[PDB]
Every structure is written in C-alpha cells, then in structure tokens.
Structure 1
Amino acid sequence: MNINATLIGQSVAFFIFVLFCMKFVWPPVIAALQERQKKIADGLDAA
C-alpha cells in the first residue's frame, strides 16, 4: 500500500524492546525459577 519511514521506527523500537527484555526481565525470572528448583531438589535429598 503505502510503504513509509514507519518501516524503520518499528525496527528501532523492536531492537530497543528486545535488548531491554534481555537485560532487565529474563535473567531475574530465570534465576528465581532455578533457585526454587534447587530448593525443591535439596529437600528431596533428605534421604
């Protein structure tokens, strides 16, 4: 239809969002999940 300069701002926002998710969202949640799994596994070693 009308290919515009909107094609560029969309990719810039895409990269900004992906980098902020990679640095400030994914690591804390993954660390919390892995620490809870470690806690559960440790309690299974009571034997």
Structure 2
Amino acid sequence: MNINATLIGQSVAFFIFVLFCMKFVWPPVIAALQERQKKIADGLDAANRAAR
C-alpha cells in the first residue's frame, strides 16, 4: 500500500532529534573519551621521562 501523508511531519521530527544529539549528547562523550587517551598518553610519556 502507498498513500502520501505525514511526509513533512517525519522530516521535521528528524531534524529535532539530530540537533539535540549534536548539542547535548555528542560533545560530553567525546571529551570523556579523549581524557582516557590523554591520561594514558601522559602515563606512557612520564614512564619514558623517568628512564630518560
């Protein structure tokens, strides 16, 4: 079955969830992800400085 209805409704609803994720969800998770990498990088570098 195919009847054209609710096309504009779903189109607008998608942008709302995309911009919400972009502002609220995405930045804090990447910051927390980078901190572990930075802490481990500092730890491995500090171990090399100790030998040096």
Tell me which residue corresponds to 2:43. Answer: 43
Runs of 4+ in 1 over 6 A off after TM superposition: none
Superposition TM-score, scaled by structure 1 size: 0.84
Question: Percent of aligned pairs with the same residue?
Answer: 98
Residue by residue over 1:17-46, the C-alpha shift from the partner in whole angstroms, topping out at 9 and shown as x without a partner, is: 000000000000000000110001000017
- SS in structure 2 of the partner of residue 3 of structure 1: coil
Cα-Cα RMSD? 1.8
Q: Which residue of 2 aligns with 1:29?
A: 29
Bigger helix fraction = 2
Structure 2 residues without counterparts, runs of 5 or longer: 46-50
**Bigger radius of gyration:** 2
Equivalent residues, number: 47
Q: What is the CA–CA distance in structure 2 between the aligned matches of 1:31 and 1:37, rounded to whole Å?
A: 10
TM-score normalised by length of structure 2: 0.77
**C-alpha separation between the residues in 2 aligned to 1:25 and 1:15?**
15
